[PDB]
Structure formats: C-alpha cells, structure tokens
Structure 1
Amino acid sequence: GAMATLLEKTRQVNELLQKNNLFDVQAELPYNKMAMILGDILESNAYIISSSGDLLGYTEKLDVNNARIKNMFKEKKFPQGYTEAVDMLKVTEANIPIDSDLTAFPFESRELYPFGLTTIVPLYGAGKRLGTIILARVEKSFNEDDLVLAEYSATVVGMQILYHQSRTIEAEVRSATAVQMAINTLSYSELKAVHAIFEALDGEEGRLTASSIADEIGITRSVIVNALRKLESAGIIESRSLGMKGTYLKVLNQQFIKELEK
C-alpha cells in the first residue's frame, strides 16, 4: 500500500541514518554516505549543503555502461551563487523545472534532460536553518509520497548535523570566551596597541620589534608591552625572545582578529 510503502521507507531511513552516526571523518565529503542512502531510498540524485553553502556530500547515479575513467574523478561544483540562492528558499520547493536557475542539473544539460526535476528541501531543526537537501530526478516527478519522505529525511539529516555540531561546541565556546575575556582585560592603552600589533605582524605569524612600533603608534613604551604579556599569559599568542632582533610571536587563536576588527 502507498502508506505502508512510505512507512517502510521511513523505517529504512531510521535504521540506516537515525540509528547510526554517519559523519565520515576523513571522507572526501563527510556526508557522502548519507547522501547515497538518501538517493537510494528517495530514488534521486541527492546533495547535502551546509548552512554556510558548503557542499557536504552528494550522490549522482553513474552511467556504468558508458563509464570513462577520465570523467569519473570530476568534483561536482555548483554555479557561482547557487548555494546562496537556495539559502533564500525558506520552504520546500518541489518539481523545479530545468529552465530555472534553481535546477540542480548543470545548465549545459538543460537540453539533454528537458523534463529533469529538482526538489529543494531546507533543513530546519530547533528553530535553526541547518543546511539544505537537494534532490534531482531525470524522469519521475516528485509526488506527495516523495515529499513526505523527503521532509522526513531532512529531519534525520538535521539531527546528524546537530549531533556533529554538538561534538565541536565545547571546544568552540571555550576559545570564544577566552578571547572575550582577554579583550575585556585591556585598556585603550594596550588595545589600540594590540590592534597595531596584528597590523604589523601581518600573516598572523612573523617577527616583531615592539620598541620600534611604539613610536609608530604614539603609545607609551611600557604600555605596548603590557598588552603582550597579557595576551600571552592569557594564552592567545606564543613568544620567544630574539634578543636585539626583537620578539617573535605566534597567533594561537585565529578567531581573535575577527572579534577585534568588529
């Protein structure tokens, strides 16, 4: 039955994607396996795009009988602006024809697959946009059965993404709060000093002559140094004394500069 068929597919999705962790560390794309499962169950080509527009994984059915080794290693790339455009879609769009710029088919293929259809499914979970799932079928349309399964699949993918994010979050906030406290522990004296330090110390890593720079900024010569010992003891940079040459520094938290240029 249509409903029994749909149900069994949702069960297959559950067994394969809800009851397993599918983040492939060291894969070409971390979610290629997840995309493959989705494309199989949904009988589609499938692409998983992060909330920032990065392709996280995809599956395209290979034409085995006509395969050519030269063509098999080509990386799928979406046209300039496609990932930003899909992000503007806030609800599912189904059966997008190939003449739309939202088609998942390369634009060269518009002639080859005039009836190719694309369905774009925003991934929302817990109020957040988590990315987007894109499905493409050369021949069949997406019916209402397919849309339910697609929406079901998006939530399962959303959970995988939310779970992967959770494993990172502890180390992320530890570093952000550290940057924030180090920024707070600064005066105008040391801060505009720090600003110029990263300016001269271009590349994030390089040598520095704190004394010389002091003149460049019109800041007291002890004040310049106070920012240094604060940041390094706070744990954001590394230093070794070069003697007359100066002191050589190393940026250890790269999100710092983003917070200071804000």
Structure 2
Amino acid sequence: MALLQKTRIINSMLQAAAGKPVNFKEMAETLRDVIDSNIFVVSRRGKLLGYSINQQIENDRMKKMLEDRQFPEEYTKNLFNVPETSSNLDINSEYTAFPVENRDLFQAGLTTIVPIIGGGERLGTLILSRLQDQFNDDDLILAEYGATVVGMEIL
C-alpha cells in the first residue's frame, strides 16, 4: 500500500485516541501494523512503555525483558550515543535489538533506532527490528511520525 494509506492508518488511530488515557501499547501495535516490524518504546532508563512483537522469538532472556517491561541497563544507556535516527543497523551493531547470544540465528536481523525527543530533551527511544527486509524512507517517515507523537503523548 501507498504511504498515504499507512499514514491515514496512524492518523485515524491518533484522531480517535485524543483524548483518552494515553495508550503506548496501541501506538506500538499500529506502527507494527504499518511498518511490519517489532516495535519497542523505551524510556531513558530502559522501561518498556509499549511494545508490539511481530516475530515471536525463542530466547528466554528476551521473553523476560518483555515480561519485566525492562530492557538492559548498559544497552539502554548506550542508546543516548545515537543522537539521530540510525536505520538498518545489522546484527553485529552494539545497538542491535536482537539478543546477542543468537547472532548466528538472526544474521539477517536489522534494527532502526529512533530518538524520541520533546522540549529539546531526549525522552526515550523508539526501536524497530525485523529480519531481512531493509528499512526504507517510508518506514522512516512512519517511524519518525510515531516517535514524535510518542514524544508529545509522553508530556
């Protein structure tokens, strides 16, 4: 589908949701639907504000992070070192959203890191991951739209 269709999908969701008690789970599921990727909305200190999983993986440490709603400390800290969107980061990147013990299995795993920003403040990070299919401009548009509005709905 065309980009305008996908943006319309986010827009209808935003239009109906404003105002109800903010729903990051819903935003993550929407982005997952239009970007076709795993979605994690991660706070400054690693708290999962929302996520939506597009691939079930059999890694226990990963399943725990989602049950805990908490990403690792070091990994989460290091996300501040990416000041601007950085896309198509491969399995060997320190920023990969796939678990490192499974690099062999997820050799084609791609990660996109999107700073969530609001008031000149890095409020969090929106992480996108999936297998094999390179992220393109359209995915970035949708990703950044979502990160911007999440940055707003965080306030």
Q: Give the TM bin, normalised by the shorter chain.
A: 0.7 to 0.9
Aligned to 2:26: 33
Q: Supply the AA of the counterpart residue of 2:88.
A: N
1:69-148 equivalences under 5 Å are: 74-76=64-66, 77-148=70-141
Unaligned runs of 5+ in 1: 25-30, 163-262
CA distance in 1, matches of 2:154, 2:142: 18
TM-score normalised according to structure 1 size:
0.51
CA distance in 2, matches of 1:101, 1:22: 35
Tell whether 2:11 aligns with 1:14.
yes
The 1:108–1:122 alpha-carbon spacing in structure 2 relative to 1, beyond 3 Å, is: same
- Between the aligned residues of both structures, percent identity stands at 47
Question: What SS does structure 2 have at the residue aligned with 1:98?
Answer: coil
Aligned length: 148
The 1:32–1:18 alpha-carbon spacing in structure 2 relative to 1, beyond 3 Å, is: same
CA contact (8 A) 1:94 1:119 kept: yes
Shift of 1:155: 1.2
Unaligned runs of 5+ in 2: none
Q: Supply the AA of the counterpart residue of 1:114.
A: Q
Shift of 1:42: 1.1
The 1:99–1:48 alpha-carbon spacing in structure 2 relative to 1, beyond 3 Å, is: same
Shift of 1:137: 0.9
The 1:91–1:62 alpha-carbon spacing in structure 2 relative to 1, beyond 3 Å, is: closer
CA contact (8 A) 1:6 1:145 kept: yes
CA distance in 2, matches of 1:125, 1:56: 16
CA distance in 2, matches of 1:99, 1:79: 17
Cα shift readout 1:18-72 (whole Å, capped 9, x = no counterpart): 5404635xxxxxx223212211111100100123332211122255xx99xx9xx
TM-score normalised according to structure 2 size:
0.82
Aligned to 2:39: 46
Q: Supply the AA of the counterpart residue of 1:46.
A: I
Aligned to 1:185: none
Q: Supply the AA of the counterpart residue of 1:9.
A: K
Shift of 1:122: 0.2
Indicate the structure whose relative CO is greater, using CA pairs within 8 Å and at least 6 residues apart. 2
Q: Supply the AA of the counterpart residue of 2:28.
A: A
RMSD between superposed Cα atoms in Å: 2.5
Larger % of helix: which? 1
